[PDB]
Design a protein around this ligand. Structure first.
Ligand code: HEC
Ligand code: FES
Lengths: 108, 103
């Protein structure tokens, strides 16, 4: 790709410190501020039921792959202008590789 | 300085003082109020933990809500018609002795 595997353990702690405030990853996990992300890989943006997405996310219709996800995480608002996800971004590719490695695994 | 009362989620009333111009997050942070998780993003509109529920007469004269606050506020738990993000609300004369509720 333009994405390579990292440390899932490192990625777990990245999740906890940077994403857990708003999201769950487990199957049967609830929506919070943000939507539960189980099964995100391969699904298009805006399709978790019971969550109120912005117009912007839905119409962006991103197919979530480890690769898209990387560009998204760099700068969410640059990627989906108008998203209400209030997260600045993960500028280091190594951080993103770690986190996505952990998401790839925990969201299946 | 003015008195502000906070009804915490446990039901305990926290009575404290802040200076006019201070945000409600400033009030919580400086006085070490025991409100679990309050002020997570340290007032940058990236969290909903500073959500407070205001008295109606206070609420109606608050500064116009910005789109940025609204997007974050939309995600808060226990939203009411008198809800604002506290880190955006600064103390005014009219708030002396007011009560806010932590949902
Ligand atoms: C301050 C809360 C917040 C944080 C922190 C946050 N998100 Fe989000 N996230 C949201 C919200 C709100 C949405 C919904 C966006 C909308 O509808 O525009 C979102 C949407 C998402 C989406 C799109 C989901 C879909 O079904 O299309 C992904 C992927 C995502 N977040 C991943 C994460 C990851 C991974 C992190 C950790 C770096 C993270 N987010 C950090 C709030 C947050
Ligand atoms: S402290 Fe996070 S938005 Fe108020």
């Amino acid at each position: 790709t333009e994405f390579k595997a990292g440390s899932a353990k490192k990625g777990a702690t990245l999740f906890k410190t940077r994403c857990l405030q708003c999201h769950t990853v487990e199957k049967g996990g609830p929506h919070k501020c943000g939507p539960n992300l189980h099964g995100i890989f391969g699904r298009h943006s805006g399709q978790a039921e019971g969550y109120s997405y912005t117009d912007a996310n839905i119409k962006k219709n991103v197919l979530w792959d480890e690769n898209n996800m990387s560009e998204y995480l760099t700068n969410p608002k640059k990627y989906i202008p108008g998203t209400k996800m209030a997260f600045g971004g993960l500028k280091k590719e190594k951080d993103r590789n770690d986190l996505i490695t952990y998401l790839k695994k925990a969201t299946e | 300085k003015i008195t502000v009362h906070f009804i915490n989620r446990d039901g305990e009333t926290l009575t404290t003082k802040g200076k006019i111009g201070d945000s409600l997050l400033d009030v919580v942070v400086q006085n070490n109020l025991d409100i679990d998780g309050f002020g997570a993003c340290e007032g940058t509109l990236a969290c909903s933990t500073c959500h407070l529920i205001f008295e109606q007469h206070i609420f109606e004269k608050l500064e116009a809500i910005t789109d940025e606050e609204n997007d974050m506020l939309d995600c808060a738990y226990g939203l009411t018609d008198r809800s604002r993000l506290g880190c955006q609300i600064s103390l005014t004369k009219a708030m002396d002795n007011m009560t806010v509720r932590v949902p």
